[PDB]
Amino acid sequence: IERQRIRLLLALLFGACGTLAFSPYDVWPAAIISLMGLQALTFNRRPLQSAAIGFCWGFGLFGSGINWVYVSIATFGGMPGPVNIFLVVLLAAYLSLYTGLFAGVLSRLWPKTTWLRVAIAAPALWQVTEFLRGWVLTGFPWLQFGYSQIDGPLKGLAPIMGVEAINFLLMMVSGLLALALVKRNWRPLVVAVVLFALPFPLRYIQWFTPQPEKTIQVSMVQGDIPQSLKWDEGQLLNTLKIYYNATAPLMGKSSLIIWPESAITDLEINQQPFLKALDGELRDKGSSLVTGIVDARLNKQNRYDTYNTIITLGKGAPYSYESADRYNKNHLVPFGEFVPLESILSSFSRGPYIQPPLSANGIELTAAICYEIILGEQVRDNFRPDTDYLLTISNDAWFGKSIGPWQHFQMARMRALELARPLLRSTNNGITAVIGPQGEIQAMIPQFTREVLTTNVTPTTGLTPYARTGNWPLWVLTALFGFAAVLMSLRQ
Ligand SMILES: CCCCCCCC/C=C\CCCCCCCC(=O)OC[C@H](O)CO
């Protein structure tokens, strides 16, 4: 009943089981079953056989939860049908090389099924595997099972140690469950249930203190403009008319107005009179505007540097082309925004890794453009104690009518819970919502519409343990399990 081909096919099923645990489905027990399969199917196999089981397990997970990038390739790349499919398969195969490396190293150094393998060696080795997947070649740390516990019992662990710590606990509990199920021993099962029920009383603790006196009315415009690679005439006039006519009635009623990523589809240097006239009108009616735009700035080398920029206008933030109250994108998308090859004979420019928060009407907002919100370590480093709200703008017009924007929206909720700060997410047509300090959704408008999300938000001024330390304590605990497990395997 173990021809390994059965384990290869079962790894495909247990791998795709994890996709059913994210935002479009919200079934967090699917993560435990997905990890138990990867933990169990790697028992008593060759280092190369276990590596193939891990590679096949990762191929089923990424083949189901990442395939939504095909339409993104079927829109920007222009390649034929079969070529776009091969690029998605090669992406899923590359992302599966890390999970196969995890099961390969776990079997080469721990061939036997011991409680140290599944509860000590597996979680420690899993943190190093997922790190390399989300760091190598400007990594893609997508589909992390810690993002599923945003609404579950283990939510109280994120503000203490981070989302990557929940990934450490899920592998430890599922390892004990897979061990207790094969050996038919009730002892690891009880330890697993205990270690899983312990983090529950942590969700009823609030490291933040809301300030109802500083409650303000915020508005976020959802433009829902059609996508066209060609910059035509009139498209800018129609886009500017749509965003203004939805913003003009808000002035004098909402203090903070937010436009999504690259709302002004023109260069910043070309819309100087449009921004000057809009800044002066906002200052008169007592309001501010935070909008995304593309900035083509001249370097002192007399060269042009293109940035994916966030600019501020209005009261408390007078607009100026040389103002430092802006935000430039740091970590860029590998293919869509730059070219990985340095010399081959259109590329954007990266911003600073740490940028000061945006100030509008005295409100501090640490910005993160689109993909940057899923990087919990970088967001915490940019985070500051005086930050009132977390700001995230994105253009999820790509991969529409898919599970992509939901997985992206779910990872953004974790940043609010990690830092105990409200999240302001404004999109062109994606998931425009307001997330509370505990990851709770306070407001949300539907997708694919041209509406305006207007609600009231209250700032907090807490300091979670993760905000002070970050993933730094997790690597300490990871090194302790790693050194103890390797020394135990080398204790021969
Ligand atoms: C012992 C470690 C000290 C580190 C220096 C503390 C500087 C910030 C001080 C207070 C704000 C505490 C919360 C601020 C959280 C974001 C700032 C931060 O983490 O600084 C990064 C660190 O300096 C390198 O990565």
Nearest Cα residue to 59 out of 51, 70, 47: 51
Nearest Cα residue to 28 out of 19, 38, 41, 37: 19
- Ligand 1 centroid from CA 469, angstroms: 8
Question: Which residue lies with its CA nearest to atom 13 of ligand 1?
Answer: 468
- Method used experimentally: X-ray
Nearest 5°: phi and psi at 423? -115, 130
Question: Which residue lies with its CA nearest to atom 14 of ligand 1?
Answer: 384
Q: Which atom of ligand 1 is found nearest the CA of 463?
A: 13
For the record, the structure tokens of 44 come out as 């008593």
Q: What is the CA radius of gyration of the chain?
A: 24
Provide the 10 A C-beta neighbour count for residue 273: 8
Q: Which of 329, 337, 364, 418 is catalytic?
A: 329
Euclidean distance between CA atoms 281 and 267, whole angstroms: 21
Element housing 278 (H / E): helix 272-284
For the record, the structure tokens of 355 come out as 């940028």
Residue 107 and residue 51 in contact, taking contact as beta carbons nearer than 8 Å: yes
Residue 365 and residue 424 in contact, taking contact as beta carbons nearer than 8 Å: yes
389-394, strands of its sheet edge to edge = 358-360, 363-369, 389-394, 423-427, 433-435, 441-444
Cα 337 to Cα 75, 171, 297, 306, distances in angstroms: 14, 34, 17, 10
Provide the 10 A C-beta neighbour count for residue 24: 15
3-class secondary-structure state, position 290: strand
DSSP 3-state percent helix, strand, coil across the chain (nearest 5): 50, 15, 35
Pocket of ligand 1 (CB under 6 A): 381, 383, 385, 467-468
Work out the burial of residue 78: count CB atoms within 10 Å of its CB; fewer than 13 is exposed, 13-18 middle, 19 or more buried: exposed
Residue 47 and residue 5 in contact, taking contact as beta carbons nearer than 8 Å: no
**How many whole angstroms from its chain centre is CA 428?**
18
Amino acid at 128: V
Euclidean distance between CA atoms 198 and 204, whole angstroms: 13
Which residue reads 């173990």 in tokens?
2
Residue 351 and residue 330 in contact, taking contact as beta carbons nearer than 8 Å: yes
Q: Which of 164, 261, 268, 418 is catalytic?
A: 261
3-class secondary-structure state, position 250: helix
Euclidean distance between CA atoms 480 and 209, whole angstroms: 35
Residue 291 and residue 278 in contact, taking contact as beta carbons nearer than 8 Å: no
- Ligand 1 centroid from CA 447, angstroms: 38
Return the sign of the alpha-carbon dihedral for residues 79, 81, 82, 84.
positive
Work out the burial of residue 484: count CB atoms within 10 Å of its CB; fewer than 13 is exposed, 13-18 middle, 19 or more buried: middle
Active site residue 17: no
Q: Does residue 358 come out as left (phi exceeding 0), alpha (psi in the -120 to 50 range) or beta?
A: beta
Q: What are residue 366's DSSP bridge partners?
A: 390
Residue 393 and residue 262 in contact, taking contact as beta carbons nearer than 8 Å: no
- Ligand 1 centroid from CA 382, angstroms: 10
Q: Which of 155, 164, 268, 370 is catalytic?
A: 370
Nearest Cα residue to 136 out of 418, 334, 268, 309: 334
Element housing 120 (H / E): none
* Residues contacting 78, CB < 8 A, separation 6+: none
H-only helix segments in 147-306: 158-161, 163-182, 186-197, 235-245, 272-284
For a mutational test of ligand 1's pocket, the pick from 364, 379, 383, 476, i.e. the residue with the most ligand atoms closer than 8 A to its C-beta, is: 383
Cα 453 to Cα 442, 446, 448, distances in angstroms: 11, 10, 13
Active site residue 261: yes
Provide the 10 A C-beta neighbour count for residue 443: 16
Name the DSSP letter for residue 86: H
Q: What are residue 460's DSSP bridge partners?
A: 210
**Superfamily of chain region 212-469:** Carbon-nitrogen hydrolase (3.60.110.10)
Residue 332 and residue 138 in contact, taking contact as beta carbons nearer than 8 Å: yes
